[PDB]
Scaffold this active site. Structure first.
Site, PDB file in Angstrom:
ATOM      1  CB  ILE A  12      46.260  29.681  42.103  1.00  0.00           C
ATOM      2  CG1 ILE A  12      46.592  28.202  41.897  1.00  0.00           C
ATOM      3  CG2 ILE A  12      44.826  29.859  42.604  1.00  0.00           C
ATOM      4  CD1 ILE A  12      48.048  27.950  41.586  1.00  0.00           C
ATOM      5  CB  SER A  34      37.009  37.767  38.660  1.00  0.00           C
ATOM      6  OG  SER A  34      38.178  38.105  39.387  1.00  0.00           O
ATOM      7  NE  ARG A  35      36.718  41.065  44.704  1.00  0.00           N
ATOM      8  CZ  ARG A  35      37.449  41.345  45.777  1.00  0.00           C
ATOM      9  NH1 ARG A  35      36.889  41.915  46.837  1.00  0.00           N
ATOM     10  NH2 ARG A  35      38.744  41.060  45.791  1.00  0.00           N
ATOM     11  CE  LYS A  88      47.780  25.516  49.239  1.00  0.00           C
ATOM     12  NZ  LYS A  88      48.166  26.942  49.431  1.00  0.00           N
ATOM     13  CG  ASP A 166      48.529  29.833  51.916  1.00  0.00           C
ATOM     14  OD1 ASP A 166      47.436  29.247  51.765  1.00  0.00           O
ATOM     15  OD2 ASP A 166      49.119  30.423  50.985  1.00  0.00           O
TER      16      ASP A 166
HETATM   17  N1  LIG Z   1      49.572  31.349  44.699  1.00  0.00           N
HETATM   18  C1  LIG Z   1      49.955  29.995  45.002  1.00  0.00           C
HETATM   19  O1  LIG Z   1      51.084  29.705  45.036  1.00  0.00           O
HETATM   20  C2  LIG Z   1      48.870  28.921  45.276  1.00  0.00           C
HETATM   21  C3  LIG Z   1      49.043  27.649  44.800  1.00  0.00           C
HETATM   22  C4  LIG Z   1      48.111  26.707  45.032  1.00  0.00           C
HETATM   23  C5  LIG Z   1      46.958  27.030  45.759  1.00  0.00           C
HETATM   24  N2  LIG Z   1      46.780  28.304  46.238  1.00  0.00           N
HETATM   25  C6  LIG Z   1      45.546  28.629  46.999  1.00  0.00           C
HETATM   26  O2  LIG Z   1      44.638  29.104  46.176  1.00  0.00           O
HETATM   27  C7  LIG Z   1      43.878  30.317  46.916  1.00  0.00           C
HETATM   28  C8  LIG Z   1      44.028  31.633  46.126  1.00  0.00           C
HETATM   29  O3  LIG Z   1      45.434  32.022  46.133  1.00  0.00           O
HETATM   30  P1  LIG Z   1      45.993  33.327  45.260  1.00  0.00           P
HETATM   31  O4  LIG Z   1      47.462  33.236  45.165  1.00  0.00           O
HETATM   32  O5  LIG Z   1      45.380  33.310  43.858  1.00  0.00           O
HETATM   33  O6  LIG Z   1      45.604  34.686  46.044  1.00  0.00           O
HETATM   34  P2  LIG Z   1      44.870  35.998  45.308  1.00  0.00           P
HETATM   35  O7  LIG Z   1      45.437  36.177  43.962  1.00  0.00           O
HETATM   36  O8  LIG Z   1      45.105  37.287  46.160  1.00  0.00           O
HETATM   37  O9  LIG Z   1      43.259  35.687  45.199  1.00  0.00           O
HETATM   38  C9  LIG Z   1      42.745  35.323  43.915  1.00  0.00           C
HETATM   39  C10 LIG Z   1      41.513  36.209  43.593  1.00  0.00           C
HETATM   40  O10 LIG Z   1      40.438  36.089  44.710  1.00  0.00           O
HETATM   41  C11 LIG Z   1      39.681  37.448  44.649  1.00  0.00           C
HETATM   42  N3  LIG Z   1      39.613  38.063  46.012  1.00  0.00           N
HETATM   43  C12 LIG Z   1      40.407  38.656  46.909  1.00  0.00           C
HETATM   44  N4  LIG Z   1      39.620  38.975  47.951  1.00  0.00           N
HETATM   45  C13 LIG Z   1      38.345  38.569  47.676  1.00  0.00           C
HETATM   46  C14 LIG Z   1      37.171  38.659  48.410  1.00  0.00           C
HETATM   47  N5  LIG Z   1      36.678  39.154  49.691  1.00  0.00           N
HETATM   48  N6  LIG Z   1      36.028  38.176  47.904  1.00  0.00           N
HETATM   49  C15 LIG Z   1      36.024  37.597  46.670  1.00  0.00           C
HETATM   50  N7  LIG Z   1      37.168  37.508  45.951  1.00  0.00           N
HETATM   51  C16 LIG Z   1      38.334  38.002  46.469  1.00  0.00           C
HETATM   52  C17 LIG Z   1      40.376  38.199  43.872  1.00  0.00           C
HETATM   53  O11 LIG Z   1      39.756  38.308  42.546  1.00  0.00           O
HETATM   54  P3  LIG Z   1      38.961  39.751  42.125  1.00  0.00           P
HETATM   55  O12 LIG Z   1      39.636  40.937  42.801  1.00  0.00           O
HETATM   56  O13 LIG Z   1      39.011  39.933  40.650  1.00  0.00           O
HETATM   57  O14 LIG Z   1      37.525  39.623  42.590  1.00  0.00           O
HETATM   58  C18 LIG Z   1      41.823  37.445  43.621  1.00  0.00           C
HETATM   59  O15 LIG Z   1      42.329  37.855  42.323  1.00  0.00           O
HETATM   60  C19 LIG Z   1      44.415  30.426  48.110  1.00  0.00           C
HETATM   61  O16 LIG Z   1      43.565  29.688  49.121  1.00  0.00           O
HETATM   62  C20 LIG Z   1      45.793  29.755  48.014  1.00  0.00           C
HETATM   63  O17 LIG Z   1      46.169  29.260  49.212  1.00  0.00           O
HETATM   64  C21 LIG Z   1      47.711  29.248  46.004  1.00  0.00           C
HETATM   65  O1  LIG Z   2      50.115  28.645  48.758  1.00  0.00           O
HETATM   66  C1  LIG Z   2      51.339  27.946  48.478  1.00  0.00           C
HETATM   67  C2  LIG Z   2      52.396  28.928  48.128  1.00  0.00           C
HETATM   68  O2  LIG Z   2      52.783  29.659  49.326  1.00  0.00           O
HETATM   69  C3  LIG Z   2      53.635  28.327  47.530  1.00  0.00           C
HETATM   70  O3  LIG Z   2      54.699  28.535  48.460  1.00  0.00           O
HETATM   71  C4  LIG Z   2      53.621  26.823  47.172  1.00  0.00           C
HETATM   72  O4  LIG Z   2      52.315  26.133  47.067  1.00  0.00           O
HETATM   73  C5  LIG Z   2      51.130  27.015  47.294  1.00  0.00           C
HETATM   74  O5  LIG Z   2      50.056  26.222  47.520  1.00  0.00           O
END
Ligand SMILES: NC(=O)c1ccc[n+]([C@@H]2O[C@H](COP(=O)([O-])OP(=O)(O)OC[C@H]3O[C@@H](n4cnc5c(N)ncnc54)[C@H](OP(=O)(O)O)[C@@H]3O)[C@@H](O)[C@H]2O)c1
Ligand SMILES: O[C@@H]1[C@@H](O)[C@@H](O)CO[C@H]1O
Ligand SMILES: NC(=O)c1ccc[n+]([C@@H]2O[C@H](COP(=O)([O-])OP(=O)(O)OC[C@H]3O[C@@H](n4cnc5c(N)ncnc54)[C@H](OP(=O)(O)O)[C@@H]3O)[C@@H](O)[C@H]2O)c1
EC number: 1.1.1.376
Lengths: 306, 300
Positions: A12, A34-35, A88, A166
């Protein structure tokens, strides 16, 4: 301007946060933590601790990492005197969000619990239309294929990861913004694959304080096209939000909406709250999810491909 | 003085509520509602709606029914303009309590979510001693046997958190800083929906670890103990809050008077135009259900 750091550069952060930040003139992207990822054009750190230690003139931080690490990062950022914006859900628990809010308020810092779906173009028009109308029933359907939307992702199946809630909490964030009166859970059913700790599907049945039933179905087993819809039965016909808030119909006639700009809106609001010296922490969507885990029946289902 | 009604005349209404009320002149027990019980000496109704319609000079009501039916009763009492006192927990869900709190605040009415364990004699001395001192760790030990009742094993029945929350209401009272849950494990038998045992790993806002174990299985120890390690020694609370040791020296406590203290505070809240709704003990339990890993064991 206001100096801004972004933490956790994954799905995201690249798709939504960084493009929105660049187009927002009130923010100057200064550093990223970011790691395993690097953002060209700004200073880069492998963890938030090192970012905060070196970036002493930095004003604000935006967290886009999984929710399980959200409290520790947000506490560290507020302790350093930075305003904090939260993806969120705002936390893995309700207590940690209340603690962060008290901490931010004592330091006079801005805490912003964001709900991107609330900024979908259909939300405010639906809210205005519903404020002064007899609502009879509310139906929520929020289904999508997890393997297309979170491929290989593991934190969604771990404690604090919410599972199908989620994206399901996106629907609840819309519902709690468009309905004029508060919700209370009456029953819930959580369907949990035997190899994960969070539900893959769920059914929530609530009522507003006047007894208006609110039935919601969430499912991560689905075909390739999403069903993200909210239907509100009214004495003046049905208000129908579809496509996660990008499409609105009222009494069978479509409503023309501006383009979807959820994350620019969020960041514009983050900037306004900082300028006003205010916070914006609405936990009602997570409180309802917590009530679902606390009060809901838990049913087992066959394992999932993880 | 304050005219008062009591709803749900079960054993602890008989054993604790009514004697406490009859012993404090600040209240005048005016009516009681209950389906299968009548209270000599006062007017009796079979439900709260009839009571509320008939008793129009009534000032307040105390609700003793289980929390699953208490929310509708509490709403009706607040819409009637009555001060409300609630048995614990203040609701089946946190949403229920938030709704009542906003409703009471909207009408300027007193809402009191009680935690009778917080009125145990060791609680205030322990809290006054710990306010100023450097706390290192906190351990909560709660074990008992369940075979010595079916609502407890059902969705929202809380399971071992039904008695366990009383310990949590004392912990959250004596500690000077709020708790965040970091890890929890709920052991649920395969034929029920609520945990028989559970452990909570928390930290306060200063990082102090607070561990809590609850177990309802057959075993060697019947245990209720809260131990708070400080730089000045161990503060220990035992016997459900009736016993206190500071730095290994026993402290002399008065007799248990939990419910007299509850009703005295209710009267003081009404006089001050104040409410007292602390949901943090329930918010912790909900966090455990939300954030805790779940584990199966053999059928109950
Ligand atoms: N994907 C969607 O559709 C979406 C949309 C809106 C909002 N969101 C919300 O936004 C949040 C992130 O979602 P995401 O889809 O981006 O998942 P994600 O890609 O797996 O997490 C984003 C980054 O967080 C880091 N990460 C993973 N484990 C970690 C840990 N213990 N400590 C520190 N950093 C860690 C990682 O970066 P590094 O490995 O480089 O450190 C990862 O690239 C979530 O709460 C999600 O609900 C998601
Ligand atoms: O995390 C959710 C993801 O699962 C997608 O289904 C739509 O909105 C994001 O916030
Ligand atoms: O013993 P207890 O333990 O002190 O609590 C149970 C009591 O609350 C009342 N109760 C139980 N279920 C109730 C329900 N659905 N609705 C209203 N009151 C209820 C009952 O009084 P009543 O059965 O007399 O109403 C019962 O005696």
């Amino acid at each position: 301007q206001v100096s801004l750091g972004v933490v956790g550069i994954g799905k995201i952060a690249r798709d939504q946060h960084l493009p929105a930040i660049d187009a927002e003139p009130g923010f100057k992207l200064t550093a990223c933590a970011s790691r395993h990822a690097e953002v060209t054009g700004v200073r880069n750190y492998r963890d938030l601790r090192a970012l905060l230690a070196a970036e002493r003139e930095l004003d604000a931080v935006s967290l886009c990492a999984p929710p399980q690490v959200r409290y520790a990062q947000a506490r560290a950022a507020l302790e350093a005197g930075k305003h904090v914006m939260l993806e969120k859900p705002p936390g893995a628990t309700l207590g940690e969000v209340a603690v962060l809010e008290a901490l931010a308020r004592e330091r006079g810092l801005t805490l912003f619990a964001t709900w991107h779906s609330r900024c979908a173009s259909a939300v405010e028009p639906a809210r205005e239309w519903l404020a002064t109308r007899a609502i009879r029933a509310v139906q929520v359907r929020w289904k999508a294929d997890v393997r297309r939307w979170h491929p290989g992702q593991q934190w969604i199946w771990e404690p604090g990861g919410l599972g199908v809630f989620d994206p399901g909490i996106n629907a609840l964030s819309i519902v709690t913004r468009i309905l004029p009166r508060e919700l209370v859970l009456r029953e819930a059913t959580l369907i949990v694959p035997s190899d994960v700790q969070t539900p893959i599907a769920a059914e929530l049945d609530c009522a507003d304080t006047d007894g208006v039933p609110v039935r919601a179905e969430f499912d991560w087993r689905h075909g390739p096209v999403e069903q993200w819809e909210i239907a509100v039965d009214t004495a003046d016909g049905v208000l129908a939000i579809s496509r996660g808030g990008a499409q609105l119909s009222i009494a069978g006639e479509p409503v023309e909406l501006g383009p979807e700009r959820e994350y620019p809106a969020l960041y514009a609001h983050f900037h306004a709250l900082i300028a006003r010296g205010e916070s914006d922490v609405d936990v009602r969507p997570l409180r309802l999810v917590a009530d679902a885990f606390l009060f809901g029946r838990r049913v087992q289902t066959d394992a999932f491909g993880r």
